[PDB]
Coordinates of C-alpha atoms in Angstrom, one line a residue:
Chain V
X1 CA 128.5 142.4 71.6
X2 CA 128.5 142.0 67.7
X3 CA 131.7 143.3 66.0
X4 CA 134.8 141.8 64.5
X5 CA 138.2 142.8 65.9
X6 CA 140.3 142.0 62.8
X7 CA 138.3 144.0 60.4
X8 CA 139.0 147.2 62.1
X9 CA 142.2 149.1 61.4
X10 CA 144.9 149.1 64.1
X11 CA 144.8 151.6 66.9
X12 CA 148.4 152.9 66.3
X13 CA 147.5 153.6 62.6
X14 CA 145.6 156.7 63.7
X15 CA 147.8 159.8 63.9
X16 CA 159.4 168.9 52.3
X17 CA 162.0 166.2 53.2
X18 CA 164.4 165.0 50.6
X19 CA 163.2 162.0 48.5
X20 CA 166.3 159.9 48.7
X21 CA 166.4 160.5 52.5
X22 CA 162.8 159.5 52.7
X23 CA 163.6 156.4 50.7
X24 CA 166.5 155.5 53.2
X25 CA 164.2 156.1 56.0
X26 CA 161.4 153.8 54.9
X27 CA 163.9 151.3 53.7
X28 CA 165.1 150.8 57.2
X29 CA 161.6 149.8 58.6
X30 CA 162.0 146.3 57.3
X31 CA 163.7 143.7 59.6
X32 CA 166.4 143.0 56.9
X33 CA 166.7 146.7 55.8
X34 CA 165.4 145.8 52.4
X35 CA 162.0 144.8 51.0
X36 CA 161.2 141.1 51.6
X37 CA 161.6 138.2 49.1
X38 CA 158.3 137.6 47.3
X39 CA 158.1 133.9 46.9
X40 CA 160.0 133.1 50.3
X41 CA 158.1 131.8 53.4
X42 CA 158.4 134.0 56.5
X43 CA 160.3 133.0 59.6
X44 CA 157.3 131.4 61.3
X45 CA 156.7 129.0 58.5
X46 CA 160.4 127.8 58.5
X47 CA 161.1 124.8 60.7
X48 CA 164.3 126.3 62.1
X49 CA 162.0 128.3 64.4
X50 CA 163.2 127.2 67.9
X51 CA 159.8 126.9 69.6
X52 CA 157.8 123.7 69.5
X53 CA 154.8 123.5 67.2
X54 CA 151.4 122.3 67.9
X55 CA 150.7 118.5 68.7
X56 CA 148.8 117.8 65.5
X57 CA 151.8 118.9 63.5
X58 CA 153.9 116.6 65.5
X59 CA 151.6 113.7 64.8
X60 CA 151.6 114.5 61.1
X61 CA 155.5 114.5 61.2
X62 CA 155.6 111.2 63.0
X63 CA 153.2 109.7 60.4
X64 CA 155.4 111.2 57.5
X65 CA 158.5 109.8 59.1
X66 CA 156.9 106.3 59.7
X67 CA 155.8 106.3 56.0
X68 CA 159.3 107.1 55.0
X69 CA 160.7 104.3 57.2
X70 CA 158.2 101.7 55.7
Chain N
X1 CA 148.4 101.8 77.0
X2 CA 149.9 99.4 79.8
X3 CA 148.2 101.4 82.5
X4 CA 144.9 100.9 80.6
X5 CA 145.7 97.1 80.2
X6 CA 145.9 96.5 83.9
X7 CA 142.6 98.1 84.9
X8 CA 140.7 96.3 82.1
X9 CA 142.2 93.1 83.6
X10 CA 140.8 93.9 87.0
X11 CA 137.4 94.6 85.4
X12 CA 137.2 91.3 83.4
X13 CA 138.1 89.2 86.4
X14 CA 135.6 90.9 88.9
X15 CA 132.7 90.6 86.4
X16 CA 133.5 87.0 85.5
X17 CA 133.2 86.2 89.3
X18 CA 129.9 88.1 89.4
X19 CA 128.7 85.9 86.2
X20 CA 129.7 82.8 88.3
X21 CA 127.5 83.8 91.2
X22 CA 124.4 84.5 88.9
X23 CA 124.7 81.1 87.1
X24 CA 124.9 79.3 90.6
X25 CA 121.5 80.9 91.6
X26 CA 120.0 80.0 88.1
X27 CA 120.8 76.4 88.8
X28 CA 118.6 76.3 92.0
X29 CA 115.6 78.0 90.6
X30 CA 114.4 75.0 88.5
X31 CA 114.2 72.6 91.4
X32 CA 112.6 75.3 93.4
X33 CA 109.8 75.6 91.0
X34 CA 109.3 71.9 90.8
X35 CA 109.0 71.6 94.5
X36 CA 106.5 74.6 94.4
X37 CA 104.2 72.7 91.9
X38 CA 104.2 69.7 94.3
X39 CA 102.4 71.9 96.8
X40 CA 99.7 72.6 94.2
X41 CA 99.1 69.0 93.7
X42 CA 99.0 68.1 97.4
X43 CA 96.6 71.1 98.2
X44 CA 94.2 70.3 95.5
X45 CA 93.7 66.7 96.4
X46 CA 93.3 67.6 100.0
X47 CA 90.6 70.0 98.8
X48 CA 88.7 67.2 97.0
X49 CA 89.0 64.9 100.0
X50 CA 87.7 67.7 102.2
Chain Q
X1 CA 150.2 97.0 74.0
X2 CA 147.6 98.5 71.5
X3 CA 146.8 95.0 70.2
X4 CA 146.2 93.7 73.6
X5 CA 144.0 96.5 74.6
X6 CA 141.6 96.0 71.5
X7 CA 141.5 92.2 71.7
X8 CA 140.6 92.5 75.5
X9 CA 137.9 95.0 74.6
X10 CA 136.3 92.6 72.4
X11 CA 136.4 90.0 75.2
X12 CA 134.6 92.3 77.5
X13 CA 132.0 93.1 75.0
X14 CA 131.3 89.5 74.4
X15 CA 131.1 88.7 78.1
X16 CA 128.7 91.4 78.9
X17 CA 126.5 90.3 76.0
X18 CA 126.6 86.9 77.8
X19 CA 125.5 88.4 81.2
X20 CA 122.4 90.2 79.8
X21 CA 120.7 86.8 79.0
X22 CA 121.2 85.7 82.6
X23 CA 119.6 89.0 83.7
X24 CA 116.5 88.5 81.6
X25 CA 116.2 84.8 82.7
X26 CA 116.2 85.7 86.3
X27 CA 113.5 88.4 85.8
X28 CA 111.1 86.1 83.9
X29 CA 111.6 83.4 86.5
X30 CA 110.7 85.6 89.3
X31 CA 107.6 86.8 87.3
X32 CA 106.6 83.2 86.8
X33 CA 107.1 82.4 90.5
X34 CA 105.0 85.2 92.0
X35 CA 101.7 84.1 90.4
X36 CA 102.3 80.6 91.7
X37 CA 102.5 82.2 95.1
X38 CA 99.2 84.1 94.6
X39 CA 97.6 80.9 93.4
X40 CA 98.4 78.5 96.3
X41 CA 97.3 81.1 98.9
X42 CA 93.9 81.5 97.5
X43 CA 93.5 77.8 96.9
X44 CA 94.6 77.1 100.6
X45 CA 92.0 79.7 101.8
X46 CA 89.3 77.8 99.9
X47 CA 90.4 74.5 101.5
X48 CA 90.3 76.0 105.0
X49 CA 86.8 77.4 104.2
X50 CA 85.6 73.9 103.0
Chain Z
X1 CA 127.3 96.3 94.6
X2 CA 125.5 93.8 92.3
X3 CA 122.7 96.2 91.3
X4 CA 125.4 99.0 91.1
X5 CA 127.3 96.8 88.6
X6 CA 124.1 96.1 86.7
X7 CA 123.4 99.8 86.5
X8 CA 127.1 100.5 85.3
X9 CA 126.7 97.7 82.8
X10 CA 123.5 99.3 81.5
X11 CA 125.0 102.9 81.2
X12 CA 128.2 101.3 79.8
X13 CA 126.5 99.4 77.0
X14 CA 123.4 101.1 75.7
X15 CA 124.1 104.9 76.4
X16 CA 127.6 104.5 74.9
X17 CA 126.4 102.3 71.9
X18 CA 123.5 104.4 70.7
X19 CA 125.5 107.8 71.0
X20 CA 128.5 106.3 69.2
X21 CA 126.4 104.9 66.3
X22 CA 124.6 108.3 65.9
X23 CA 127.7 110.3 65.9
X24 CA 129.6 108.0 63.6
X25 CA 126.6 108.4 61.0
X26 CA 126.6 112.1 61.6
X27 CA 130.3 112.3 61.0
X28 CA 130.0 110.5 57.7
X29 CA 127.1 112.5 56.5
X30 CA 128.8 115.9 57.6
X31 CA 132.0 114.9 55.8
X32 CA 130.2 114.3 52.6
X33 CA 128.2 117.6 52.8
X34 CA 131.5 119.5 53.6
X35 CA 133.3 117.8 50.8
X36 CA 130.7 118.6 48.2
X37 CA 131.0 122.4 48.9
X38 CA 134.8 122.3 49.4
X39 CA 135.3 120.7 46.1
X40 CA 134.6 124.0 44.3
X41 CA 138.2 125.1 45.4
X42 CA 141.1 122.4 45.4
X43 CA 140.4 121.3 49.0
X44 CA 139.4 118.0 50.6
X45 CA 139.2 116.7 54.1
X46 CA 139.7 113.0 55.1
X47 CA 138.8 113.3 58.9
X48 CA 136.4 115.9 60.4
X49 CA 138.0 116.1 63.7
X50 CA 141.7 116.3 62.7
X51 CA 141.5 118.6 59.6
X52 CA 139.4 121.2 61.2
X53 CA 141.9 121.7 64.1
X54 CA 144.3 124.2 62.3
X55 CA 141.4 126.5 61.5
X56 CA 142.4 127.2 57.7
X57 CA 139.8 124.7 56.3
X58 CA 137.1 126.3 58.5
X59 CA 137.9 129.6 56.9
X60 CA 137.9 128.3 53.4
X61 CA 134.5 126.6 54.1
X62 CA 133.0 129.9 55.4
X63 CA 134.4 131.8 52.4
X64 CA 132.9 129.3 50.0
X65 CA 129.4 129.3 51.8
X66 CA 129.1 133.1 52.6
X67 CA 130.6 134.6 49.4
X68 CA 132.6 137.5 50.8
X69 CA 136.2 137.8 51.8
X70 CA 137.1 136.9 55.4
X71 CA 140.5 138.1 56.9
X72 CA 143.4 135.9 55.9
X73 CA 144.6 133.5 58.6
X74 CA 147.4 134.3 61.0
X75 CA 150.8 133.1 59.5
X76 CA 151.8 130.5 62.0
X77 CA 152.2 126.9 63.0
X78 CA 151.9 127.3 66.8
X79 CA 148.9 126.6 69.2
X80 CA 148.3 130.3 69.6
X81 CA 148.1 130.9 65.9
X82 CA 145.8 127.9 65.6
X83 CA 143.4 129.5 68.3
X84 CA 143.6 132.7 66.6
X85 CA 142.6 131.1 63.2
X86 CA 139.6 129.2 64.8
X87 CA 138.5 132.5 66.7
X88 CA 138.5 134.4 63.3
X89 CA 135.9 132.0 61.9
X90 CA 133.9 132.1 65.1
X91 CA 133.8 136.0 65.2
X92 CA 132.8 135.8 61.4
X93 CA 129.9 133.6 62.5
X94 CA 129.1 136.2 65.1
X95 CA 128.6 138.6 62.3
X96 CA 125.9 136.6 60.7
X97 CA 123.9 136.5 63.9
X98 CA 124.1 132.7 64.0
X99 CA 123.6 131.6 67.5
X100 CA 126.5 129.4 68.9
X101 CA 126.3 128.1 72.4
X102 CA 129.2 126.6 74.5
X103 CA 131.7 127.2 71.4
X104 CA 135.2 128.3 72.0
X105 CA 138.3 128.2 69.9
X106 CA 140.1 125.9 72.4
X107 CA 137.2 123.4 72.2
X108 CA 137.8 123.1 68.3
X109 CA 141.5 123.0 68.7
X110 CA 141.5 120.2 71.3
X111 CA 139.1 118.2 69.2
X112 CA 135.9 117.7 71.3
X113 CA 133.7 115.6 69.0
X114 CA 130.3 116.7 70.2
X115 CA 131.1 120.4 70.0
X116 CA 132.7 120.2 66.4
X117 CA 129.8 118.2 65.2
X118 CA 127.4 120.9 66.7
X119 CA 129.4 123.6 65.0
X120 CA 129.0 121.8 61.6
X121 CA 125.4 121.2 62.3
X122 CA 124.7 124.9 63.2
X123 CA 126.6 125.9 60.0
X124 CA 124.4 123.5 57.9
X125 CA 121.2 124.8 59.5
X126 CA 122.2 128.5 58.6
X127 CA 123.6 128.1 55.1
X128 CA 121.1 125.7 53.5
Chain Y
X1 CA 174.4 120.0 76.9
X2 CA 172.4 123.1 77.3
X3 CA 175.2 125.6 77.2
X4 CA 176.6 124.2 73.9
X5 CA 173.1 124.4 72.2
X6 CA 172.7 128.0 73.6
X7 CA 176.1 128.9 72.3
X8 CA 175.2 127.4 68.8
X9 CA 171.9 129.1 68.8
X10 CA 173.5 132.6 69.6
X11 CA 176.4 132.2 67.2
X12 CA 174.1 131.1 64.3
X13 CA 171.1 133.4 64.6
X14 CA 172.2 136.6 66.4
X15 CA 175.4 137.0 64.3
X16 CA 173.8 136.0 61.1
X17 CA 170.9 138.6 61.5
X18 CA 173.3 141.3 62.8
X19 CA 175.7 140.8 59.9
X20 CA 173.0 140.7 57.3
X21 CA 171.3 144.0 58.4
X22 CA 174.8 145.6 59.0
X23 CA 176.1 144.8 55.5
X24 CA 172.9 145.9 53.8
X25 CA 172.9 149.3 55.8
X26 CA 176.6 149.7 55.1
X27 CA 176.2 149.3 51.3
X28 CA 173.3 151.7 51.1
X29 CA 174.8 154.3 53.5
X30 CA 178.1 154.0 51.4
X31 CA 176.1 154.8 48.2
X32 CA 174.3 157.7 49.8
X33 CA 177.6 159.3 51.1
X34 CA 179.2 158.8 47.7
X35 CA 176.1 160.5 46.1
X36 CA 176.5 163.6 48.3
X37 CA 180.4 163.7 48.0
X38 CA 180.3 163.5 44.3
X39 CA 180.1 167.4 44.1
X40 CA 183.8 167.6 45.3
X41 CA 186.3 165.3 43.7
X42 CA 185.9 162.7 46.5
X43 CA 184.8 159.0 46.6
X44 CA 185.0 156.3 49.3
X45 CA 185.0 152.6 48.6
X46 CA 184.9 151.2 52.2
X47 CA 183.0 153.0 54.8
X48 CA 185.0 151.8 57.8
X49 CA 188.5 152.3 56.5
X50 CA 188.0 155.8 54.6
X51 CA 186.5 157.5 57.7
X52 CA 189.4 157.0 60.0
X53 CA 191.6 160.0 59.3
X54 CA 188.5 162.3 59.5
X55 CA 189.0 164.3 56.3
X56 CA 186.1 162.7 54.5
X57 CA 183.7 163.3 57.4
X58 CA 184.8 167.1 57.4
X59 CA 184.3 167.4 53.8
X60 CA 180.9 165.6 53.9
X61 CA 179.8 168.0 56.6
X62 CA 181.2 170.8 54.6
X63 CA 179.0 169.8 51.7
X64 CA 175.9 169.0 53.6
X65 CA 175.8 172.0 55.9
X66 CA 176.9 174.5 53.3
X67 CA 179.0 176.6 55.8
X68 CA 182.7 176.5 56.4
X69 CA 184.4 174.4 59.0
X70 CA 187.7 174.9 60.8
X71 CA 190.9 174.0 58.9
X72 CA 192.0 170.3 59.6
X73 CA 195.2 169.7 61.5
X74 CA 198.3 168.8 59.6
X75 CA 199.6 165.3 60.4
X76 CA 199.6 161.5 59.8
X77 CA 199.7 160.5 63.6
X78 CA 196.9 158.8 65.5
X79 CA 196.4 161.9 67.5
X80 CA 195.9 164.1 64.4
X81 CA 193.1 161.6 63.2
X82 CA 191.6 162.0 66.7
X83 CA 191.7 165.8 66.3
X84 CA 190.1 165.5 62.9
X85 CA 187.4 163.3 64.0
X86 CA 186.9 165.5 67.1
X87 CA 186.4 168.6 65.0
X88 CA 183.6 167.1 63.1
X89 CA 181.9 165.5 66.1
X90 CA 182.0 168.9 68.0
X91 CA 180.6 170.7 64.9
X92 CA 177.7 168.3 65.0
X93 CA 177.2 169.1 68.7
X94 CA 177.1 172.8 67.6
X95 CA 174.4 172.1 65.1
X96 CA 172.2 171.0 68.2
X97 CA 172.3 167.3 67.0
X98 CA 172.4 164.7 69.8
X99 CA 175.1 162.1 69.5
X100 CA 175.2 159.3 72.1
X101 CA 178.2 157.0 73.0
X102 CA 180.3 159.0 70.5
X103 CA 184.0 159.5 70.7
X104 CA 187.0 160.1 68.5
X105 CA 188.7 156.8 69.3
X106 CA 185.7 154.9 68.2
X107 CA 185.7 156.4 64.7
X108 CA 189.5 156.1 64.6
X109 CA 189.4 152.4 65.6
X110 CA 186.7 151.7 63.1
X111 CA 184.0 150.3 65.3
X112 CA 181.3 149.2 62.9
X113 CA 178.2 149.8 64.8
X114 CA 179.2 153.2 66.1
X115 CA 180.2 154.4 62.6
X116 CA 176.9 153.2 61.1
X117 CA 175.0 154.9 64.0
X118 CA 176.9 158.1 63.3
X119 CA 176.0 157.9 59.7
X120 CA 172.3 157.1 60.5
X121 CA 172.1 160.0 62.9
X122 CA 173.5 162.4 60.1
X123 CA 171.0 161.0 57.8
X124 CA 168.0 161.4 60.2
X125 CA 168.4 164.5 62.3
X126 CA 170.8 166.8 60.4
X127 CA 168.9 169.4 58.2
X128 CA 170.5 170.0 54.8
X129 CA 171.2 173.7 53.8

């Protein structure tokens, strides 16, 4: 009854080879096959995400557009 | 907003008509009380005569 | 539409504030009348006894 | 219908008016109390009902008050990520054995006034 | 209408993501193949074009496995290239490695995804010496 879901580690986390081949194996895990750009926002932050956002963000965007229109 | 406006208009018209009815009764109450005091006067001088 | 909504809201508030005074006057008129009723019946009983 | 109209007049005027005055005063006072503690970091809220929807500022306020590190918010701008971010703060409150009743993530996200005010009041009663 | 927007979404997003991952993996795969091919006097510049005749694949398997492969056929025709690719693929079948949707004409015709998949399977499952 009193526990936090997010503080626990994920369930799937619980369970010689050439070094360069290990490097190419763990380089392929990233979606872009390379380490991500540090100061770049993720795909969810970007506004070209096709799915519509929450309503409060739409009201904020409307108010920004209205202040731009003057 | 327009759908709200129409039901507000209905409300104000109905309640205005209610106010008119209450004012109409409030007019009659005063002459009613005066006619009631006249009975006091008649009854007390009848009592003295008796 | 928004402007019309809020001005009619103000009208509704003013008019209910108007109606409350008629309510109070009605109540106090009736509370004045009932003791006149109780007075005349007692004094008429005294007159009949005399 | 006349006495029915009078009863509707009474419960439209007085019950609404007293509750609205009390909740407006409580909203201003709670806004000042939250702004005092949230000014240690560079954060400020203008409206209590609107800025608390996304759940980030609730996490910042709980981090300032409690003093340890809550899990970082879910990286998103959708309704589901919003619900997740509010649920994180609610679960962290469930750690501290603070008793919350009729409180859910969707109630904060939708912006129910009474439940948001009650959440702020419960936080004030705990962390003062 | 809806179909035009769906086509635009497909052509932008799917192709952009696929090409980006494909060129990154091709670059790093080419560097790895050159690193293992530097023992002999061999070097490839483009992964798709240089693997068509099948000599580089045979020499790469010769270097990696450390055991002798059959002699490549003599010729410059398309069918000789099919022979040279088939020898290397059949040797990979001999080393118990499971290749899927693999044929000689795919390597000879230079299909990008299948070439990258073959190189990735060689990187993953093939044991070296």
